[PDB]
Amino acid sequence: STGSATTTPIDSLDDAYITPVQIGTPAQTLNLDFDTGSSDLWVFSSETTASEVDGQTIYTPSKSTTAKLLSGATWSISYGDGSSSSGDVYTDTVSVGGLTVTGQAVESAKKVSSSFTEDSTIDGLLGLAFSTLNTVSPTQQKTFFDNAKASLDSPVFTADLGYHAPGTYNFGFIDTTAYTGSITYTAVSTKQGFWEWTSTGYAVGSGTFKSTSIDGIADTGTTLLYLPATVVSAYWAQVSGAKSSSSVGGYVFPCSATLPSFTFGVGSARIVIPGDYIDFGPISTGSSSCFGGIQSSAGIGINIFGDVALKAAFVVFNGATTPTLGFASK
């Protein structure tokens, strides 16, 4: 089997992407944030505290003839950005782009943090990291991809995120029309539960490539590119007037600037992020200070190849017995 679904930016900045997902019988379609940095499929629901729901579409398990309470199971998650949610668990039928999994754990939120409430466009998350990170207790549950894997034509999914435009998540096949040149594959460590890999270096604009190992994660659920302070300083030094602002919480730059590209290495291959992808616009409405899309990972504890980086590539998440990651230009 295979599946193919379009993923759409939630706003004009590509802060996140949403993908329609069918849950239950008859189908209830919710727009979920596919997150290769976490491993829980959770949704706003009829159980979510009413004051914490503001415009989201909810899953109502009582209206699904295939929903079953997973008795005694609870979940609770905290993300890197400080957001969180928790609740109980149902199993139900879940379909993405024509690919159906029966008995998928659907984690129903009883509580969500303010950031989730305030984002009316995101009805929940669909985790695509390794199932070892799943938070369900006392019986850990599998991700949608892990459940689907055996049925897929090939044990892979691909992320093809758009810049200010829709893109695609495919399951079970590699669309050879969706990228240019060749896909370069690179080793993955699953030891922390992430799609963790080592970039071979970087360049800023038309500058020379610096060969240096940068360990990090491919994370579709993180907006920005978070890299070591040395690398980030070298980037922003090429932008007149750019500075790190403790009050804003990262690098900002004059909105009148033209940003240089940023290149990262994948083995002997190179992925170029155009300068415009690194512009996240005014820090507040009407401001001439703009927020940068490349930020320091110091204090996070891990480097994160988030959407800024991933959207510049066609990315293969190869879930074979020994997982790997593939990157192609597009």
Ligand X SMILES: Cc1cc(C(=O)Nc2ccncc2)c(C)o1
What are the residues whose beta carbons fall under 8 Å from the beta carbon of 87, sequence distance 6 or more? 42, 45, 47, 48, 74, 75, 107, 108, 109, 110, 111
Q: Which of 37, 124, 260, 326 binds ligand X (CB under 6 A)?
A: 37
Residue with smaller CB distance to ligand X, 147 or 220: 220
Nearer to ligand X, 145 or 202 (CB): 145
**Per rule CB under 6 A, is residue 116 in the interface with ligand X?**
yes
The residue annotated as part of the active site, out of 39, 199, 261, 296, is: 199
Q: Is 199 a catalytic residue?
A: yes
Q: Which region, judged by CB under 6 A, interacts with ligand X, from 111-119, 136-144, 149-157, 284-292?
A: 111-119
Residue 216 engages ligand X in binding (rule: CB under 6 A): no
Figure out which of the listed residues 41, 122, 126, 310 binds ligand X, where binding follows CB under 6 A: 122
Give the span between the Cα atoms of 289 and 50, in whole angstroms: 37
Q: Which is nearer to ligand X, 155 or 292 (CB)?
A: 292
Tell the residue number behind the tokens 């990291």, with chain if given: 129
Q: Is position 7 an interface residue for ligand X (rule: CB under 6 A)?
A: no
Pairwise CA distance, residues 141 & 60, whole Å: 20
For ligand X, give the closer residue by CB, 37 or 260. Answer: 37
> Going residue by residue from 74 to 93, which x/- string records binding to ligand X, judged by CB under 6 A?
-----xxx-x----------
- Report how far residue 285's alpha carbon sits from residue 288's, in angstroms, rounded to the nearest whole number: 9
Q: Is 76 a catalytic residue?
A: no
Stretch that binds ligand X, among 50-58, 113-121, 271-279, 285-293 (CB under 6 A): 113-121
Q: Is 306 near ligand X (CB under 6 A)?
A: no
Instruction: Give whichever of 81 and 175 is closer to ligand X, judged by the CB atom.
Output: 81
**Which CB sits closer to ligand X, 23 or 32?**
32
6 near ligand X, judged by CB under 6 A? no
Q: Of 152, 133, 154, 151, give the one whose Cα is nearest residue 142.
A: 133
Cβ(303)–Cβ(234) under 8 Å?
no
Q: Does 154 bind ligand X (CB under 6 A)?
A: no
DSSP string, 232-275: HHHHHTTSTT-EEETTTTEEEEETTPPPPPEEEEETTEEEEE-G
Letters for 276-295 (x = contact with ligand X by CB under 6 A, - = none) are --------------------
Let me know: does 319 contact 155? Beta carbons within 8 Å: yes
Is 287 strand, coil or helix? coil
The H-assigned helical ranges of the chain are 114-118, 144-148, 229-236, 307-310
Active-site annotation, residues: 35, 199
Residues of the shown chain interacting with ligand X in the complex, contacts defined by CB under 6 A: 33, 35, 37-38, 79-81, 83, 115-116, 119, 122, 125, 221-222
